[PDB]
Amino acid sequence: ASMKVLFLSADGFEDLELIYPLHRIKEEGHEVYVASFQRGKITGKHGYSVNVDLTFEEVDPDEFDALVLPGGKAPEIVRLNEKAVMITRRMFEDDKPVASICHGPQILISAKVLKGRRGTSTITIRDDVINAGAEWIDAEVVVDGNWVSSRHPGDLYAWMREFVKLLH
Amino acid sequence: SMKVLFLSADGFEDLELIYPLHRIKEEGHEVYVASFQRGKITGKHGYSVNVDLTFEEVDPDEFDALVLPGGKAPEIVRLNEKAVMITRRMFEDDKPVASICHGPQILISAKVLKGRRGTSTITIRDDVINAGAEWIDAEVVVDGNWVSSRHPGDLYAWMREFVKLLH
């Protein structure tokens, strides 16, 4: 079956980490939506632009089948938005497929869903993932039930290779 | 499992090189970045990729498919006789060749486009037409072995069709 996949991001996203899964997932015939603080566009660390489909306030988590959490600087401000964190917690706790890369897990940390879980992130926040109760693993991709996690843009091939398997 | 060669240089459009590298590797194919020299090459937006081999080191007979990303790189790549030879040989041998944006400037220089059909960035439409091809404004065009797209907005469709050609 086809899915509606939600992406949470903001200005300062790591360009490849948002744009790669958008296209890769759309290739499969899934529908992709980007939520952020405001309608309009968001701009990456490296200058690429992405259109925003809806705001965090507008999101009904029950309307979406899967969640993607790219990295960059964006997770540090996205994790301060209580709605974005509530969306994340709801979707993750409902056991919907959730994909994260790089700093994306800072949103998962804030969502208080990582205790007893296993995955990865940029190693620069390894200690924070551990402090959130998860086992941190240094690997290109980790699959922990619904949670598919990778570290950085070198891992993109493996990240979506594993994530697309959950999107049916 | 095929060996897929990418021709690029400094000034490449970052997504147009990096998206297909990962997308194709996902499939279990082996990917190779060739440029003027060993070391690294850096995109328009500052992403870096390692160079696996030089143009002069490439035997086109050892590669199964070819990818030609865009940006500023094609305009200097098309000046390299060997890079142009690699592309002419692989294309005439009917191996899968994917191009996007300015990548077809290399195909123009390889003199392989007469009576062919495809796309590119619209800013070089007239040059593709002058090379003997029919130019189509579409997110992806498939003309036998030649899969062509225009710009980063077309990436999903571009590799969707190209991966099919690879299997």
Automatic annotation (TrEMBL), chain A:
<dbReference type="InterPro" id="IPR002818">
    <property type="entry name" value="DJ-1/PfpI"/>
</dbReference>
<dbReference type="Pfam" id="PF01965">
    <property type="entry name" value="DJ-1_PfpI"/>
</dbReference>
<dbReference type="InterPro" id="IPR006286">
    <property type="entry name" value="C56_PfpI-like"/>
</dbReference>
<keyword id="KW-0645">Protease</keyword>
<comment type="similarity">
    <text>Belongs to the peptidase C56 family.</text>
</comment>
<protein>
    <submittedName>
        <fullName>Intracellular protease I</fullName>
    </submittedName>
</protein>
<dbReference type="GO" id="GO:0008233">
    <property type="term" value="F:peptidase activity"/>
</dbReference>
<dbReference type="InterPro" id="IPR053435">
    <property type="entry name" value="Peptidase_C56_Deglycase"/>
</dbReference>
<dbReference type="GO" id="GO:0006508">
    <property type="term" value="P:proteolysis"/>
</dbReference>
<dbReference type="InterPro" id="IPR029062">
    <property type="entry name" value="Class_I_gatase-like"/>
</dbReference>
<keyword id="KW-0378">Hydrolase</keyword>
<feature type="domain" description="DJ-1/PfpI">
    <location>
        <begin position="3"/>
        <end position="165"/>
    </location>
</feature>
From TrEMBL, chain B:
<comment type="similarity">
    <text>Belongs to the peptidase C56 family.</text>
</comment>
<dbReference type="InterPro" id="IPR029062">
    <property type="entry name" value="Class_I_gatase-like"/>
</dbReference>
<keyword id="KW-0378">Hydrolase</keyword>
<dbReference type="InterPro" id="IPR053435">
    <property type="entry name" value="Peptidase_C56_Deglycase"/>
</dbReference>
<protein>
    <submittedName>
        <fullName>Intracellular protease I</fullName>
    </submittedName>
</protein>
<dbReference type="InterPro" id="IPR002818">
    <property type="entry name" value="DJ-1/PfpI"/>
</dbReference>
<dbReference type="GO" id="GO:0008233">
    <property type="term" value="F:peptidase activity"/>
</dbReference>
<dbReference type="Pfam" id="PF01965">
    <property type="entry name" value="DJ-1_PfpI"/>
</dbReference>
<keyword id="KW-0645">Protease</keyword>
<dbReference type="InterPro" id="IPR006286">
    <property type="entry name" value="C56_PfpI-like"/>
</dbReference>
<feature type="domain" description="DJ-1/PfpI">
    <location>
        <begin position="2"/>
        <end position="164"/>
    </location>
</feature>
<dbReference type="GO" id="GO:0006508">
    <property type="term" value="P:proteolysis"/>
</dbReference>
